[PDB]
RNA sequence: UUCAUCUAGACAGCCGGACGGUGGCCAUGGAAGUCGGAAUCCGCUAAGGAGUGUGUAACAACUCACCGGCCGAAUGAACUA
């Protein structure tokens, strides 16, 4: 006895067992037959609509995610292995959560769109910081002095709990208003964010730094080769 | 004090600074606090608890099923 | 200046109904007699049905457009006739629209749609037409979706 | 249901005899307006010179005897 | 009836049949079934017309036929159903299609009825009887709250006149 | 046990002590002039049905204690259409024999228009039958009846024709205002109740 | 004891995603997954309920159902004595 009791939910969705895995290699492994080059695209922190937007703007070819073991099984772990001739390189450069861009179109094409694509992001935690933001003084609202408090609703009071103890700020209740003594610093310009001043940041909806995809290399099928794009890996 | 004049002082002044961490402790206690009960409460008591366990797993195993 | 955009449901044809856009207009400072007759007058196509408004904002104007919506399109080709809140509730919404008419509300619903298909768009809309509770070619719209997926009904645009 | 007429999953949100007009209404509550005020000016005649007014003063009416 | 012996069995819907008619110039036979269906029969042959109708999410409760004073020569009376899921749906023969869905009523409605002015009486277990007008796009003219329990039947005065159609006692 | 809990909380009303009623659309200033008048803890928040029941405050005037009613807002709707939150506002002012002051916005902020706001007056116009009866327009810092269209100046006048209604004008950030129009509430009422005692 | 999961990744933990038609239909003063009544579908997915709860006057925000990244070797459930 004296063990932890797992807690029950009753929903409606169940989990994926060793089929959805399998599904996965065999769709790598025979658009790997299908097409003619093989992206290696790096895709940390993505949003869904985002990625939704890549897929409908890469019609025609074929983006596949899921585990990053699966999808190196899948292209062959060793030289021994692989599904086609120096695909162990290719497979060995994955890395993260690893997205494959099974597609036909022009490299010179390719580079260019992922090159220009750009959207703006969610400041995530280790990097640096886009702005320095400072909540007011006085009565805070839920952009924190981003846009003019005459035009922004005041910050709501179910929020005071997670302001004052997950994001560390000292906030009262002042009639049913979240009220703080002095003003907030809450990040300075050119430093390393952790996850507080992340959470802090998206709670108050900020939204200043880039998100960019990253190419890590390409296989061709007829030249059996890989070469390396090195795009957006600054 | 006049209508839900307690959920309108928990609006405009919020709750003890404590609550919610107390709460989560308390709640977090009762898994070991419902074994002492378990083992310690004798007699009319400790046949009612028993009882009353039983129709709560029966009722549980049938929300489940 | 700098465009703002407000978004708000409302029953269309019905004059004066900018009263919930009262925090909204306050700190614009707006006139709200004007703002509801310029919603009407943007939403005057549909009577009695509830639509999306667009309300655009920039120095001192006060502009009024109709969002495409699937449950709003879908009552619009259903033709019902225009019902008053004072005679008419709790409608079923149960008449007959034809495939034609559903790939042409996929067509107006497909520029704002991840579908890569116009049968992927035209499947959403049944979809949404079977939550509406209607009838597609007298037959329900998930058999319509089961032939498509079958092969038994092309949708003509590729 | 009572949890349908009140409490926390209540339904129930209009009348179930709506008054035709508010014309109908002032009358029937003047109506019983009227019938409430001759009411507590009946019971006024015995019941408050009797019963209530003894409170005040702290005065109770003496035991019945068992002899009754 | 004649010789007490059965002359046609009728075996087209799935589940319980709750309703059977007969049209008012004596020439179909509206059953309405269980599984939300309804089914038009020639009786002199004991068989089924077409397909059945369908659109009802229930059971059907009751039928009504249209009055031949109102139906216009040499077309065929349409056919009321009600059912437990509060729709009124009227049903044209001629093309075997649905015209109107009636759907103010918020429970089962119990009964439905078709005078001989162009109106229908509904009643519900919505404690409400509305009134219909098939020459307003069946839109609900009249809605009468009076009980305080579900309305299980209605009737009318010249019923037995509408029932009737043409005949008479004598069979001409 | 969900009665007694809920009837436990109802503010205690005197239905025959001097009373003054406050009614209107919603969004009008019903509860910001019960806040001004009185020391009730009623919110008052930018959109419609804020208050959803009944709320009592007390003050003094010429040694007298006046309580004053807050009610929550009347849409122009028939009897049958009309809903319980509603009917709580109609049966205080049918019952509550006292002086109503209905509240109007000429500024439309409420949501509502002018000519909303007078059909409504003249639909609860059978209402106060009996009563003292005031019209109060509110928001006069943001407009003022004197600035008014002429189609409206004549819908106002309309309102005034009704015997015996007077029409004035106030602001809840006014307090001299509020003042002058609580007190001149209280004298009709005053001067109602003791014309009725004298008989 | 019997079933299951598992180095094409065991249990816990942390972080990220958790989408689009859509604020699905009716109803409501208001009801946008989360006061209610019936449907409960389609698309894109690695996965994402016409929603497990907290929360809002309604929104928002958080959460978990589910998926992924880090970690690296056993683990969970039901019975019997
Ligand atoms: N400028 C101005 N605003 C007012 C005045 N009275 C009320 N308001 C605004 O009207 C809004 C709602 O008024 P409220 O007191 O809730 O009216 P109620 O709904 O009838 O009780 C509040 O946000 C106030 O800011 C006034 O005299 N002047
Ligand atoms: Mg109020």
Redesign the pocket.
Same mark, same amino acid.
């Given at each position: 006895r004296s063990?932890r009791?797992?807690?029950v939910?009753?929903?409606?969705?169940?989990?994926?067992?060793?089929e959805? *895995?399998?599904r996965?290699?065999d769709e790598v492994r025979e658009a790997l037959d299908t097409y003619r080059y093989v992206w290696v695209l790096h895709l940390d922190?993505?949003?869904?609509?985002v990625?939704?937007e890549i897929?409908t703007s890469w019609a025609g070819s074929k983006?596949?995610?899921?585990?990053?073991?699966?999808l190196q099984?899948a292209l062959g772990e060793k030289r021994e292995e692989e599904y086609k001739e120096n695909l162990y390189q290719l497979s060995k450069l994955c890395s993260?959560?690893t997205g494959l861009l099974f597609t036909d179109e022009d490299v010179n094409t390719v580079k260019e769109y992922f090159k220009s694509y750009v959207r703006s992001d969610?400041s995530?935690?280790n990097t640096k910081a886009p702005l320095t933001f400072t909540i007011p003084e006085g009565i805070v609202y839920s952009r924190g002095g981003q846009i003019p408090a005459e035009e922004d609703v005041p910050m709501?009071h179910?929020?005071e709990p997670t302001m004052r103890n997950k994001f560390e700020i000292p906030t009262k209740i002042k009639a049913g208003k979240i009220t703080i003594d002095s003003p907030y610093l809450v990040c300075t310009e050119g430093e390393k964010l952790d996850?507080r001043q992340?959470?802090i940041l *998206?709670?108050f909806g900020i939204a200043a730094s880039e998100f960019k995809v990253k190419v890590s290399a390409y296989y061709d099928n007829d030249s059996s080769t890989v070469e390396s794009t090195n795009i957006n890996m600054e | 004090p006049q209508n839900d004049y307690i959920e309108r002082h928990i609006?405009q002044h919020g709750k003890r600074l404590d609550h919610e961490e107390r709460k989560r402790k308390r709640e977090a206690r009762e898994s070991h606090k419902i074994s002492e009960r378990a083992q310690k409460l004798t007699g009319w008591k400790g046949k009612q608890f028993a009882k009353k366990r039983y129709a709560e797993k029966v009722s549980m195993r049938k929300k489940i099923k | 200046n700098e465009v703002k955009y407000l978004? /708000? +449901?409302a029953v269309g044809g019905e004059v004066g109904a900018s009263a919930?856009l009262a925090?909204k207009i306050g700190p614009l400072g707006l006139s709200p007699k004007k703002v509801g007759e310029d919603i009407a007058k943007a939403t005057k196509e549909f009577k009695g049905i509830?639509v999306t408004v667009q309300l655009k904002i920039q120095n001192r104007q006060a502009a009024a457009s109709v969002v495409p919506?699937?449950?709003s399109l879908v009552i619009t080709a259903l033709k019902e006739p225009p019902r008053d809140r004072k005679k008419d509730?709790?409608?079923k919404?149960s008449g007959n629209i034809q495939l034609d008419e559903i790939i042409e509300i996929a067509r107006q619903?497909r520029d704002?749609?991840?579908? +890569?298909?116009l049968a992927?768009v035209t499947?959403?809309? /049944?979809?949404?037409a079977?939550?509406?509770?209607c009838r597609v070619d007298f037959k329900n719209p998930?058999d319509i979706?089961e032939g498509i997926?079958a092969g038994e009904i092309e949708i003509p645009e590729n | 249901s009572y949890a349908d007429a009140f409490g926390?999953?209540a339904?129930r949100?209009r009348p179930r005899l709506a008054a035709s007009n508010l014309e109908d209404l002032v009358k029937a509550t003047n109506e019983d307006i009227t019938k409430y005020e001759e009411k507590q000016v009946l019971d006024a005649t015995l019941g408050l010179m009797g019963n209530q007014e003894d409170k005040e003063n702290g005065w109770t009416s003496a035991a019945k005897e068992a002899i009754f | 009836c004649d010789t007490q012996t059965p002359m046609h069995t009728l075996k087209g819907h799935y589940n319980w049949v709750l309703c059977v008619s007969w049209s008012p110039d004596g020439e179909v036979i509206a059953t309405g079934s269980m599984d939300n269906t309804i089914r038009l029969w020639d009786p002199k042959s004991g068989q089924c017309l077409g397909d059945a109708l369908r659109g009802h999410s229930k059971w059907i409760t009751s039928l009504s036929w249209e009055p031949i004073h109102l139906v216009k020569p040499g077309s065929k009376p349409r056919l009321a159903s009600s059912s437990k899921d509060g729709t009124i749906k009227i049903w044209d023969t001629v093309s075997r299609v649905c015209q109107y869905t009636m759907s103010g009523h918020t429970n089962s409605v119990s009964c439905v009825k078709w005078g001989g002015q162009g109106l229908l009486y509904s009643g519900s277990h919505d404690r409400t009887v509305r009134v219909w007008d098939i020459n307003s796009q069946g839109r609900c003219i009249n809605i009468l709250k009076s009980h305080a329990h579900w309305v299980n039947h209605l009737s009318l005065s010249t019923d037995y006149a509408l029932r009737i159609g043409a005949f008479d006692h004598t069979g001409k | 046990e969900q009665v007694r809990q809920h009837i436990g909380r109802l503010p205690s009303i005197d239905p025959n002590t001097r009373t003054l009623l406050i009614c209107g659309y919603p969004n009008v200033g019903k509860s910001s002039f019960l806040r001004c008048i009185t020391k009730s803890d009623v919110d008052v928040?930018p959109?419609?049905?804020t208050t959803?029941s009944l709320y009592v405050g007390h003050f003094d005037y010429k040694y007298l204690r006046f309580q004053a009613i807050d009610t929550p807002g009347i849409?122009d709707r028939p009897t049958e259409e009309m809903?319980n939150?509603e009917m709580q506002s109609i049966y205080a002012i049918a019952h509550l024999r006292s002086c109503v002051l209905y509240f109007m916005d000429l500024s439309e902020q409420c949501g509502f228009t002018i000519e909303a706001q007078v059909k409504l007056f003249h639909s609860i116009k059978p209402l106060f039958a009996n009563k003292s009866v005031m019209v109060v327009i509110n928001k006069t810092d943001i407009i003022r009846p004197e600035d008014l269209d002429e189609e409206r100046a004549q819908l106002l006048e309309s309102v005034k024709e009704v015997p015996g209604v007077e029409i004035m004008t106030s602001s809840c950030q006014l307090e001299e205002n509020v003042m002058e129009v609580r007190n001149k509430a209280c004298e009709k009422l005053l001067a109602s109740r003791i014309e009725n005692k004298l008989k």
């Open positions: 063990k009791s797992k807690l939910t009753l929903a409606q969705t169940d989990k994926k067992g060793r959805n *895995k399998e996965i290699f922190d993505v949003r869904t609509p990625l939704q897929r983006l596949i995610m899921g585990k990053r073991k699966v099984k993260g959560v969610y995530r935690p709501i179910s929020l996850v992340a959470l *998206k709670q | 609006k | 978004y /708000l +449901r919930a925090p509830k919506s699937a449950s509730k709790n409608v919404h619903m704002k749609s991840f579908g +890569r298909t992927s499947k959403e809309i /049944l979809g949404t079977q939550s509406v509770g998930h979706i997926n | 926390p999953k339904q949100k | - | 928040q959109y419609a049905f959803k849409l809903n939150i």
